[PDB]
């Protein structure tokens, strides 16, 4: 009934051309051609080209909410592991401005999802800082990927704007569960604790104003320092 909103903002190309010129099998081409709106509910195993690349996905049912009693914290969990394990409606990819893969979480999301993720990214012209692109998740257990570009260094309005762009696209398109990674921390140099407070603060904001639209915001903390910082902040 609705066309998805796939970019939160308003609108090198040789590389994009080369990525898009690569041959596809007929089975891969059929996956790539599924309309973005249908991917959420399609039976992915009905497509002969598809498989899930994560042997034991983590489902909503397996996540421990921070506090079941609380109207907000029943919808938040922490996960000790990579965001790519999470079988949710979307996971967040901490991309760069080119939005064509890279190192760290960007690179691992591309490896698990398979080469169609890169190909879909090559159909649009990058992602501005503060904004979010939506793509299918291909071989990930999660249905979609929310590609966001965080700021370099400690720019709080810009980082807030990432979390807003992500949560706003999720609400508009009916994505009810989101797996977050730690945007702008590590090599982009946003200090970990202040970044974490922005992430949790914006998420709380959304959960207060839009209770019946979001079932679960999961914060995947692959590293120990990330996990302990989030753990201390939430309870």
Residue numbers in the entry: 11 to 21, 38 to 261
Paper text:
We named these proteins as Trypanosoma brucei MacroD-like protein (TbMDO) and Trypanosoma cruzi MacroD-like protein (TcMDO). We show that the trypanosomatid MacroD1/MacroD2 homologues are hydrolyzing both protein-linked ADP-ribose and free O-acetyl-ADP-ribose. The macrodomain fold (starting from residues 99 and 92 in TbMDO and TcMDO, respectively) is well-conserved between the human MacroD proteins and consists of a central mostly parallel six-stranded β-sheet surrounded by five α-helices. Active site of the macrodomains is located at the C-terminal edge of the β-sheet and is lined by N-terminal ends of four α-helices.
Crystal structures of TbMDO were determined to 1.95 Å and 1.2 Å resolution (for crystal form 1 and 2, respectively) and crystal structure of TcMDO to 2.0 Å resolution. The two crystal forms of TbMDO are almost identical with RMSD of 0.4 Å. Structures of TbMDO and TcMDO comprise residues from 11–261 and 13–257, respectively and share a highly conserved structure (RMSD 0.84 Å). While the N-terminus of the TbMDO folds back to the core and extends the β-sheet, the N-terminus of the TcMDO packs to the precisely same site but in the neighboring molecule in the crystal. When comparing the ADP-ribose bound structure to apo-TbMDO, it is evident that the binding site for ADP-ribose in TbMDO is preformed. Upon binding of ADP-ribose, eight water molecules (and a glycerol molecule) are displaced but no large conformational changes in coordinating residues are observed.
